[PDB]
Amino acid sequence: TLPSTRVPAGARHPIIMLAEHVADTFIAMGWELAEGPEVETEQFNFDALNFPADHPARGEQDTFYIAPEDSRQLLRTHTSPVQIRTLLARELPVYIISIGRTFRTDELDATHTPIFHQVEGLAVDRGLSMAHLRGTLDAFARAEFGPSARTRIRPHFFPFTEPSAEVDVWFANKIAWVEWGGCGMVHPNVLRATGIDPDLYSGFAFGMGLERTLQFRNGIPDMRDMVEGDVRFSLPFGVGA
Amino acid sequence: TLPSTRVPAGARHPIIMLAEHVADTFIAMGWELAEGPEVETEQFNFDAL
Amino acid sequence: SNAMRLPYSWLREVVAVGASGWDVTPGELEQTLLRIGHEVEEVIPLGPVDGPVTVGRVARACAVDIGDRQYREIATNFAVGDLVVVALPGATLPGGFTMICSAAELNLGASGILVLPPGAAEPGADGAGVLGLDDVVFHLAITPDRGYCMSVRGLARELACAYDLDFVDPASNSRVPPLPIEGPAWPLTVQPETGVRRFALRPVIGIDPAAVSPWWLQRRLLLCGIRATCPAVDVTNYVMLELGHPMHAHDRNRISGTLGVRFARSGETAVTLDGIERKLDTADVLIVDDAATAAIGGVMGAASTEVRADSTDVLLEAAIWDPAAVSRTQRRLHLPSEAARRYERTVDPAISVAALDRCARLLADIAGGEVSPTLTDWRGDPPCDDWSPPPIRMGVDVPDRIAGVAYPQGTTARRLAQIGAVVTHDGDTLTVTPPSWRPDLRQPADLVEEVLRLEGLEVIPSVLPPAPAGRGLTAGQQRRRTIGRSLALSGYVEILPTPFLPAGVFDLWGLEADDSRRMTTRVLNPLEADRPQLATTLLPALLEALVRNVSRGLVDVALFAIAQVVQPTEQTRGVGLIPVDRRPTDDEIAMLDASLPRQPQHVAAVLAGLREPRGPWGPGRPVEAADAFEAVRIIARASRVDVTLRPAQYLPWHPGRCAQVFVGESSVGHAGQLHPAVIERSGLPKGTCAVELNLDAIPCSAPLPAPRVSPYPAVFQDVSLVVAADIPAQAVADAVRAGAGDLLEDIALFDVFTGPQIGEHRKSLTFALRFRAPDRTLTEDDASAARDAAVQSAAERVGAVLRG
Amino acid sequence: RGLTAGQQRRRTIGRSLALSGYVEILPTPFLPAGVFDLWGLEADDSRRMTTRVLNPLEADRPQLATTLLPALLEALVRNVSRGLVDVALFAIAQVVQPTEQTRGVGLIPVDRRPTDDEIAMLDASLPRQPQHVAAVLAGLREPRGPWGPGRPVEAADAFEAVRIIARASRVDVTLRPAQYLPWHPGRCAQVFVGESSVGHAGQLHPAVIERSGLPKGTCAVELNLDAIPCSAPLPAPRVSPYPAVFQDVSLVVAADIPAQAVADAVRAGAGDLLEDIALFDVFTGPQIGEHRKSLTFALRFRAPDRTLTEDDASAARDAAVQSAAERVGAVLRG
RNA sequence: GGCCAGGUAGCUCAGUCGGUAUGAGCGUCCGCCUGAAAAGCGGAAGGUCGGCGGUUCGAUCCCGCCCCUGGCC
Ligand SMILES: CCOC(=O)[C@@H](C)N1C(=O)COc2ccccc21
Ligand SMILES: [Mg+2]
Ligand code: NA
Ligand code: NA
């Protein structure tokens, strides 16, 4: 029974491991993974996503902008510009997931972080409907919350989707419904901004935060432990693979 | 440039790695992987086929 | 702000006009609002109170008529004779407080005590009944596409849609009788380039300055978050809340000359109604006359024409301003007023006169005024008489296809009429003209959302689409996984690195002024003003996380990270807006990409303390430079490439313990021990080592080995070679391998020896060699000939001398 | 749905062993002739109850493998006999363990689907075929280099292989002294998950090594993956911002007491303030007494909501000392 | 945006409206001690008291500006 581990194992980060599990879930459904720059142009982060010119998110309040003023260059507020780039580079149909670092202005406390990671999905094909969106969301939910997981959608608003909706998740392992993310059908202005005929192709999209998903699933009290890099937060999750 | 690897890395078998690549190829298209016993009944090995 | 507050009693009242007897639980109404797309923030009841909470009349401390010829006795803003609410001894106020109460103490609103207007209630009536504490206030967050829902009119219409009720529009002319139009009310001129769509005026003459608004009006203003003031101002705020058209009252006697809508001038100021001086911009809209400025168009009125406690003649204003101009103006001077918030979300231009007439008649009723039969109604040049948007064509089954649900026949046409559109049929194509209060309905997708949200999203089935024939993970994505798995299994712990560099980190590193790592991208609005620079290297974030662990008792640490860096090649340059009505060309895309700083993906690691822990086997082993070199080899094996290490000088590394890493002939990064000065100036632990490689510079590989296993025995031999101390041991191994030829199966260094037997600044290296032929057994001479060729190769390439 | 949890676990186990220096082989299902006689197994040892092939390619090798170790040991001998004397091999495959004499099932008509009862009958007529993972080691475990002469394989390297497999499976195991051929009875651990036995590890019996022509000191491990349940933990760590207290404790016990039993007793008595415990010294000097040993553990105490005093930590240490006295007879070193 | 209240050792926090923070608990170092440890006992190291300036022979404490947390908005 003497200890024998001369080189004790490390740990991949739980957010990276969750991102890997999410990617594997969508690969198994035929989707692929795309990536893009974190410092992004305003064209792909806002303009191509049907954001109005005087939108409050384009101000200095919520978005990290690159100096000097009016540079039209910023840290991306979502991974949506990665899907715009894919829509421009790839032929149809497109089924792509984008998992990357995202930057918001919220301060760092027990339930918010300015630097977070989110997963975004984008599917554009002939005849895609809201039923296909909901089927994909439920499959995503079961893979991450268990066999008894189910989603619920309620109408909302986002500039790049119409109709738009917020997603709630029901997981029967709570320590009820929890707000998970947003979704909707790809706005036809987004398709026209990428050279796609909205009369021939329809599409859907969704987006969830990884740190948020990890917090209420595992019941992690302080999200500052997720980002500060203390060894005591990562090692309990095991080496990971 | 002095050698620094005190624990020389091993190797997974190339046949196992090929099977893994083949499996990933089909999983990426929506297929799934199933398994069964090597000692089998004649009903399932011959008669059913 | 997207906030909208109203009491349920008022909302139920408007809905009950067309649907008599309508009444639902506040929980049911909350679920209905959520189901059709209105986010409720809070459902707060009023009070509650019980026992002795009654209304009394005042006649410091004074006697209060509690009713029935009984007088109880127990500051600031109340005189003698005002009706007040008293808390008799034994009363229980929210929550647990067991006295002239205020609106805040009764949980009803926001300084002074509550003063009921004369005639609101008889002294002695039930307090909870007069205040209406059974009511419930709904706090909603309205999305920016539904400006029509910033009012009781819009939310009541939405409920009538969701419950399939008959709806009576409170802004209609059958509900707001048309006052006479016998001539102009006031001369005005409008510059059409300012975005005004409609401007209406109607005066009210001879109102009682001592009159006060009735209690039902004041109570509804309080529950909506607006403090009552005087009848002239209360009716303008009340009609804004009721119909969604903001209204403003000007003192008619303090208007000098023709009113004018005009763009402001640079440096021009305007004293607003709050008594604060505002600096104006050239892109702002103003109402002015022959003397001063009357209002900031769509934001707030000025103190020049402000209604005061003695005003008797009121000119009422009903105008439609440009939404972009109002938003651009109110955000510059930080005035998110109730009018500005509604104008920036667009206001229904068809109800301007209807809201004006409603306002004038209500003011005269409660203040005893006289409504003048004059009216000015500017509706553009040429005058606009039809405010309907362009029609929209879409197939009758388009909402069915998008939803994936076969709705009953007529569903789409019924729902689009329910929300106010004109719907005509032409075969299988509907021509839909949205109502004037729905400028968000512009194309079929907008119409689809209306049908789907009203039918309910819960009827959309969960249907997984078929799996496309995907290719899976790319070679680069797989490699990042293998690298992460390999470092973690070797004892490294992954962190998420922050992109904002610590203040003066490169000064702590002692880098030169022209070091490329200093050329950073700056953020304009960072959370920390002294950390605006984005990271050109992952090591500062890793070393920061290393300090955190060591400072908290975890002194034996090995951390790694995989993330992009930000390395600009020019000053921050943006590209102009590309039209969104088309696809950008490949030239415009390449121009967009070229304007962005280089963002390659790096892998990096830091180590400090014990590399191997102590235990029953021994005392463990402190981190050394070779551990950083081994991390490079772990990353290399994971990437399936060969690397070479060469001595180098590159801060922040120790110049005598730093390797530059090469793949082929390309430099991919550095590794080794950190400079002791950098460690001292950074508060790092002594002996800290670090690695950073550029993954994008490492090429992906797909080797196809075909080994052939020889069944013949091997020959073992060792060779000792003396070289100058500066000769890398790998260079000797390479020279031995090139000389030995194909018989050499394995070579491994197992001895490095210095001493006087060898000579100053020289060293002896002994390698274990394994020779094997593929087709025969070797003789010792066969192996020695290969060994002798290896020795001669080493003499030629690194100056080796056979050990003697 | 992608890979199952078991298919995923098999990949992770194989990656971890390979990265730890093990070389995977493909094991043959046919047992070498008389291998169980070389091992000295009893006539009633369950591993001798084998399924036999009627027409094998080698008439002396008809039986199918109930254990992966014979095929691994045969590959180890092939490597060592050809000049590769420092080797560590592993394999993941199924074994064949019948529970009765070979019994067939008559032909089911193929014009229809077999009923679920007929399917369960066909399954019950087959021998049990669970998945195993196994490994063998000999020679140098760590090679010589400019650091020193390297380190020969010892039983602790087989125990570490168990912990590599356990960490890869995300399960906790315990190791208990056992006697079980072909292992060395004084250097053999039985491996448990909870209270269920999942295999064995350690050094092989010297007599088995002699009779089988194996390298001296050969070590081995074999675990039944089917007996290791697939786990899906969801940790919720709470990082305490308060400082820790460091103390060491030295306890004297009888030599037969396992070190893990002492650590377990120390942990049970110390309570929730104990954040970490690590053994760093085992002393059997002359001041200790015959058949006894002194063990010294490094202890890390940390409170989740306050800074501790030395007395607070010493109180938890003293309760750990009393726990060890009661459970393993430990005496505080003095 | 207001007058305030906070930033102090490696960690968590006290305390002083000018010449020593005789700072605490834990963390770090040395000795007695032990085969080596720890506790215990006895010795020590370490802060430029939020930054840039102003006053003063001398400023953690008094003036001005700014950085970041909160309370109330
Ligand atoms: C993490 C919270 O952000 C979101 O969920 C929202 C704002 N969102 C994105 O950020 C990008 O992807 C989306 C796709 C469809 C609807 C909404 C989104
Ligand atoms: Mg809409
Ligand atoms: Na070295
Ligand atoms: Na030389």
Numbering used by the authors:
A (entry chain D): 98 to 272, 276 to 341
B (entry chain A): 98 to 146
C (entry chain E): -2 to 56, 69 to 83, 87 to 110, 124 to 135, 138 to 831
D (entry chain B): 498 to 831
Article, verbatim:
AaRSs catalyze the attachment of the correct amino acid to its cognate tRNA which then is used in protein synthesis on ribosomes. Phylogenetically phenylalanyl-tRNA synthetase (PheRS), belongs to the class II aaRSs, and it is a dimer of heterodimers (αβ)2, containing two α- (PheS) and two β- (PheT) subunits. Structural studies of PheRS have shown that the α subunit binds L-Phe and ATP and is responsible for esterification catalysis. At the same time, the β subunit is involved in the recognition of the cognate tRNA molecule and editing of mis-charged tRNA.
The protein-fragment interactions were analyzed using crystal structures for five of those fragments complexed with MtPheRS/tRNAPhe (DDD00107555 (D-555), DDD01008876 (D-876), DDD00805735 (D-735), DDD00079004 (D-004) and DDD00067116 (D-116)). All five fragments occupy the L-Phe site in the α subunit of the heterotetramer. The fragments’ orientation in these structures is very similar to the L-Phe substrate, however there are subtle differences in orientation and details of interactions. PIEDA showed that the phenyl ring or the bicyclic core of the fragments interact with residues αPhe255 and αPhe257 through hydrophobic interaction. One of two carbonyl groups of the D-555 interacts with αGln215 and αGly282 through hydrogen bonds. The core and the carbonyl oxygen of the oxazinone moiety interacts with αSer177 and αArg201 through hydrogen bonds, respectively. Fragment D-555 is unique in forming key interactions with αSer117, αPhe213 and αGly282 residues. However, the auxiliary pocket in the structures of PheRS with bound fragments was completely unoccupied offering an opportunity for fragment growth by adding hydrophobic substituents to explore the auxiliary pocket of MtPheRS.
